[PDB]
């Protein structure tokens, strides 16, 4: 259940 604003394209 991640945050909808979070970007999955993390470093």
């Amino acid at each position, epitope marked *: 259940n*991640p945050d*909808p604003n979070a*970007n999955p394209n993390v470093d």
Partner: antibody
Framework: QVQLVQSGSELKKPGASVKVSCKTS????????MNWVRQAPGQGLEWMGW????????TYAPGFTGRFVFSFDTSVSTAYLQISSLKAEDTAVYYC????????????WGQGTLVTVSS | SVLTQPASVSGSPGQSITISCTAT?????????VSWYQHHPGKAPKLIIH???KRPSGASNRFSGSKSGNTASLTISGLQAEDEADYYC??????????FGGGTKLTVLG
């Protein structure tokens, strides 16, 4: 504005190889992940996986491990899909799609690339 | 498939149609990351609902989305001819993976 433009139709024999490209523009290529979706004849959309455009780590869904490779060339803001040892059941339209966030996945789509595999 | 949709739905012009989408596993978790897409032939899919109900700009306000339990639902009011298409629901299923539903063929009995 945002644009995903894929390469043209491909015709291949079984066992051959193919590499589909997905040129981007209108946004920083490395900020957003690139995803791949497949539609086989008379079937629905099937998520294949994505590649992290910052770390390069690819994620392949079960069913697209072993013969598929996601890659990108940041020099030209392009993502790539390569398939090895093509099988007839690979015949499908392959799409590339961007993911903006967990809440907004697949907000921009390529126009699709038809890959036909026939003997 | 991880998300079950009706194989087909038919409506006549002007009516409102509803398309369901049931989660077959708990991998969806909260089930709050649901998205819908309109797919016309020869063209690329188009995002029309994300986060269960959020409608983005550029998609008409005749499309709405709801949820009850583990069933996401897509309603199309004032059915038009250009609405005839394939419709898919999608959900995050943990560990940076997404899954689509089988799709529904919406027919506009016009």
């Amino acid at each position: 504005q945002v644009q995903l433009v894929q390469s043209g139709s491909e015709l291949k024999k079984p066992g051959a190889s193919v590499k589909v490209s997905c040129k981007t523009s209108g946004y920083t290529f490395t900020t957003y992940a690139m995803n791949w979706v497949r539609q086989a004849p008379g079937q629905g959309l099937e998520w294949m996986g994505w590649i992290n455009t910052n770390t390069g780590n690819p994620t392949y869904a079960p069913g697209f491990t072993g013969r598929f490779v996601f890659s990108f060339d940041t020099s030209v803001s392009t993502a790539y899909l390569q398939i090895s040892s093509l099988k007839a059941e690979d015949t499908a339209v392959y799409y590339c799609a961007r993911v903006y966030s967990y809440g907004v996945p697949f907000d921009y789509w390529g126009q699709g690339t038809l890959v036909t595999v026939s003997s | 498939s991880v998300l079950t949709q009706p194989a087909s739905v038919s409506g006549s012009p002007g009516q409102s149609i509803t398309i369901s989408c049931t989660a077959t596993s708990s991998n969806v978790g909260s089930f709050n990351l649901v998205s819908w897409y309109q797919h016309h032939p020869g063209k690329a899919p188009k995002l029309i609902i994300h986060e269960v109900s959020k409608r983005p700009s550029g998609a008409s306000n005749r499309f709405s989305g709801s949820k009850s339990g583990n069933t996401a639902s897509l309603t199309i009011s004032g059915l038009q001819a250009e609405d005839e298409a394939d419709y898919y629901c999608c959900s995050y299923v943990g560990s940076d993976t997404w899954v689509f539903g089988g799709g529904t063929k919406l027919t506009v009995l016009g």
